[model samples]
Target: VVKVGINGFGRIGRLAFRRIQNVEGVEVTRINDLTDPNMLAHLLKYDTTQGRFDGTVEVKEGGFEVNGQFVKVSAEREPANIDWATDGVEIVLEATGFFASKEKAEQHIHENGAKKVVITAPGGNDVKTVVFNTNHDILDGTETVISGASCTTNCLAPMAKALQDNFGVKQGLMTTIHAYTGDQMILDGPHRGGDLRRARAGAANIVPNSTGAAKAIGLVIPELNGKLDGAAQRVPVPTGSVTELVATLEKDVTVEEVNAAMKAAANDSYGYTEDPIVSSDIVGISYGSLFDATQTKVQTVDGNQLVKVVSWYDNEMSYTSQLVRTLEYFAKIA
Candidate 1:
């Protein structure tokens, strides 16, 4: 069995546990979180949006038990402080979104005794940022630290690659209509970071923000270097995000061609849908993105074609599914 250890039990960490809980030959042996075991158990049992999980979660002496899976919990906040090898954990998922530096992420291996560390968020340019379908070739198993990138990057990379592969894409602009994350406050509060707009109420506004999605895409698809630009806006919702992509193609293409290319590119790593569906409908879809074929539009721009397409993804669940696929791939090669 592939033993797994999760460092943060936040949104991605908890949802990742749900995905790996019942998988064959995969065991989540260790879970490290700042929250108490009782609260963790409660959160695991009853989620406000995703609804109740069909499993029993009880707090134990050392940690907690979920659906008969006994996992030891650690309250350590630092990544280097945790002892992963002691629990026989081969892989550790660092989903805290706190440690973004590649050197800091590698501390888990040198100090924590973890064989491999997979970061759930986008890391600095030093580490390998992998999107499952776009750049799986970068994984050689020699590297100790890997990044799964962000939820937006996961949705954008596939669409970018599809456009670049079928019709040559000169440049693209991506605007992610994202949901609020744990970083945002429920009500207007004091400014913690430099950004004052994000300190406002999360539920009452559509706050504009910056995203590294453009840079992340250049990393995975080197051909699109300096050609992609991105922006973001965090809406009032809690989950489900969309990536709106407008690209200038080298050749004139119809909407039908774009839909066929995107749909054909969908695999175990990504999702495709021709049906008219809303964000709530894709809540539990276990794929990275759902191409909105109904809303696809194409127009002529100078001598090139301007293509606009939208991709929907459940940020928490779909991202967890990608992380699970990464572990499964590592298990096969390891």
Candidate 2:
């Protein structure tokens, strides 16, 4: 089994930890965050959004015993202050949103630090951004630091890949109806990043924002690079999101043709569904992107054609599912 260390016990970090319980070939023995172990254990035991923990959690002196396993916990604010080597931790999941740049993230790779690191968000343009099954092939196991781009990027890659594979895509524009996240305020207040839009009450408003998923498509699908651009609408929902891509294809396509093509491209990372599902219906879905057949639309005017294809995802769980898959795969390759 691969010995893993989680750097931040945030939503992604905790969810990924909870998921590794049943996953084979990977084990988390060390967790680092800026809070007390008791608070960490309590939060993991009871969650408002995702549900309760599946097993027992007992907080001990240094950490907690989770399901008969003793996971060492630390509160080091700096990466270099921790001793990852002491715990035999080879790879560290950099889930803290702060250490996302390659230079700062490299602090976890010293003589006493972990051997490799995977940033849970965009690491910068220099770092290779991955979306699991779509662009993970770019990894060669020798890289010291890798990036799992934003959750929206994971939800967009496979859907866009299917379209590019079946029918040639000339250019596209995407808009994701996304859920509010930890970055937003519970009530109207000052945002840390100083974005006035995000300062509004997240649970009570539908806020429009920018997204790099479409602009960064080239990192995952080279064929779609510079061919797609996108924006986002952050809504009241807590965790589900849907991405709609409007594109001009080289071949004229019927709604049936697009849905059939997506079904053909379905895999573990991508799913197909025809039901009229709501955002709440997809709260715990495991697929990174689930193609919604009911929402497929084809509009043609005087032979000029545009197709709209949509996919739903539980931004939190779906992204965690994909992140763990990437972690497991990266461990094997390493």
Candidate 3:
């Protein structure tokens, strides 16, 4: 069995934790969080979000267990201080989007004695950032520490790759209509920070914000550099978030052509919905969306040759599931 350690139990972290349960031979040996064990117990009943999970991984005296499998739990606060090796874990996944520095990630790995560390979000300057299926070559055994980019990275990599391989993308623009995260203040709290716009937290309304993943997109597809840019609008919905992709190609491509390209990409990357999928349709979907044969809606500029298509991603579940699979992949080869 492959042993994995998860740091943080918030949004993406917890979702990824729920995911590893179903993957065979991928045992999550330890989970480190800042909350109390009782809090972790309460989250187990989190059926409303990420859909409901079956079976039971209850808190025991020293750890949590399901059936006969033991999963250790430690309410440690700092990633750099958690003891993963003590629990026999060699691979640590830092799911906390809070600490985004490569230096900080390295500190976590070294302190915990993990052989490899996978940061859950993109950050400053890192050469080994990856988007699981599309750009995992970044995770050569030589690169023990890695970053998973972001949810946008997971959703857009395939689409970008499709354009790059097929019509030869000139450039593109992407926008992620993302759901709210825990970092937002539930009610009007502190307007103390520079993000006074979002200082209202996640409570009231839609907040126009940044999606730095556009900067990371090139890292995923490499070819998207100098050609693509991305931004995000954080919506009020709690879970399902979607990415809309518009690509400028070298030539005019029909709607059918776009669908064919996506289908070919999914054959190698992730699934595309054959049925028109709404946000609900993508909830808890594994890695990518289903390329709806009918949902390939696009318009052509009679004089100009540019192809614009929309893609959806279930921000937390779908993306984190891909991250889990990425860890599992490295577990086998790394």
TM values, all candidates: 0.92, 0.94, 0.88
Off by over 4 Å in 2: 192-194
- Candidate 3, which segments miss by more than 4 Å at Cα? 76-83, 97-103, 107-112, 185-190, 200-204, 267-269
Best by lDDT: 2
lDDT agreement of model 1 with the native: 0.82
Look at candidate 1 and give me any clashing residue pairs. Answer: none
lDDT of 2 by residue, 13-116 (tens): 99999888878788898999988777788889998778899999999988889988788998899999989989988888999989988888899999988888
Residue range 78-118, candidate 1, lDDT tens digits: 87788888898888888876776667777778544788888
| C-alpha lDDT values of all predictions | 0.82, 0.89, 0.73
TM-score comparison, 1 vs 2, better candidate: 2
- Spell out the clash pairs found in candidate 2: none
lDDT tens digits by residue: candidate 3, 1-334? 8888888777677777778877777778888877777767667646576655567667787777765777788876667677778887878788766666667777657654677778876644763777767877666576767776677777777777877888888877787888887667777767555677567767467877777676667767767776878787787888887777776778677788878778777842377666756777777878654445564555665677656666777777778877887787776665
The TM-score, computed over Cα atoms with residue i paired to residue i, of candidate 1 is: 0.92
Ranking of all candidate structures by their TM-score, best first: 2, 1, 3
RMSD of each: 2.2, 1.7, 2.7
Query: Of the candidates numbered 1 and 3, which has the greater TM-score value?
Result: 1
